[PDB]
Amino acid sequence: SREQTMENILKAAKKKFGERGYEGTSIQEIAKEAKVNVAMASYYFNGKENLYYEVFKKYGLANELPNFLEKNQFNPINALREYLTVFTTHIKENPEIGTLAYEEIIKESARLEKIKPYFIGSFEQLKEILQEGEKQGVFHFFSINHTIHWITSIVLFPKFKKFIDSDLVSRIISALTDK
Amino acid sequence: SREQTMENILKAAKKKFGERGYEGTSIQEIAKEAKVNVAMASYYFNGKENLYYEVFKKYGLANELPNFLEKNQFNPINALREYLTVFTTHIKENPEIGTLAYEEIIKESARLEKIKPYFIGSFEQLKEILQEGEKQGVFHFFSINHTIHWITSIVLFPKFKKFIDSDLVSRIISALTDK
């Protein structure tokens, strides 16, 4: 069926886009990887750019993410522990956010507005947790922005952690709570 | 002459690699951009991978970077001011470090060891300045690592600054000196 095929194409697309980035990947490489022809792939998704958006729309974590504050009765340490655990485990297991979050959030712009709706929640929530923590007097920081900056970096990019340095959840909590 | 031609190819390569990343760019695209043929390009640089290293070796800033501490008589504020100014101006004017520092330092590994020698000095120096500042009691921070993490991010990636937030040298100095 068209839908099942489209699921196979998306899986192939996550892989190739994760490898080469948007501008580095052709619909042909994805079609080859999916064992379908280009015209079919292009028809089903209405082109490479929509196919790319569909990868975020299918594999983006935000849509199915619980509200961690609410789930933890607004305990900002428990909420943050749960949030970081959910993230670090998923990111190591799927390092196609490594390349694609970098390209689109960190470096760039062109397609930004189209994909934002699929990662901005993850950031809005981290911000909520840090600010609820600050409000409750348990977290301390100069800039919410830099804190967001540095938490993101060390979570998304564990090999850059290595480059510098040369578990993580508890390390982040300890940094935040220090006075 | 072979050398002049190679300079034209390198300029073309900085551009295309900056656009599409290593795995996203072919020697053919660079050859086309340079108005030479592929065999010549490939012969002159001994292949795409060496050509890539040559881009770092030619456009990497570290090799011609002064020692900012020494230049500023070991005043860590003046040194850091000068270091950040040199960096932010060069990075905005050449956003082919944006993509290539991300790909190689931040995300990845494969070719890491080959290119490190061409950016590790920039990081070693920032570290020196921050630590000399800390030693002299003027800079205050929990983790030298996170500080390196967050300074890098907001300097390299000004559009991610915007995504979050939604001049810089003085902002960084002020964050560091606060107690």
Residue numbers in the entry:
A (entry chain A), B (entry chain A): 4 to 169, 186 to 198
Publication excerpt:
The polypeptide chain of HlyIIR contains 201 amino acid residues and has a molecular mass of 23.5 kDa. The hemolysin II regulator gene, hlyIIR, is located immediately downstream of hlyII and its product regulates hlyII expression by specifically binding to a 44 bp perfect inverted DNA repeat (22 bp × 2), centred 48 bp upstream of the hlyII transcription initiation point. HlyIIR negatively regulates expression from the hlyII promoter in heterologous system in Escherichia coli cells. In general, the N-terminal domain of HlyIIR exhibits high sequence homology to members of the TetR family while its C-terminal portion appears to be divergent.
In the final model refined at 2.4 Å resolution all residues are within the most favoured and additionally allowed regions of the Ramachandran plot, with all stereochemical values within or better than the expected range. The model contains 179 amino acid residues (Ser4–Lys198) except for a segment of 16 residues (Leu170–Glu185) for which there was no clear electron density. In the crystal structure, the biological dimer is generated by the crystallographic 2-fold axis. The dimer of HlyIIR has an Ω shape, typical for the TetR family of repressors, with overall dimensions of about 60 Å × 60 Å × 25 Å. HlyIIR has an all α-fold, with each subunit consisting of nine α-helices. A monomer of HlyIIR can be subdivided into a small N-terminal DNA-binding domain and a larger C-terminal dimerisation domain. An important feature of the HlyIIR structure is a large internal cavity in the C-terminal α-helical bundle. This cavity is 18 Å long and has an internal volume of ∼ 550 Å3. Most of the inner surface of the cavity is lined by 25 hydrophobic residues contributed by helices α4–α8. The presence of this large cavity and analogy with the structural homologues suggest that DNA-binding properties of HlyIIR are modulated by interactions with a small-molecule ligand.
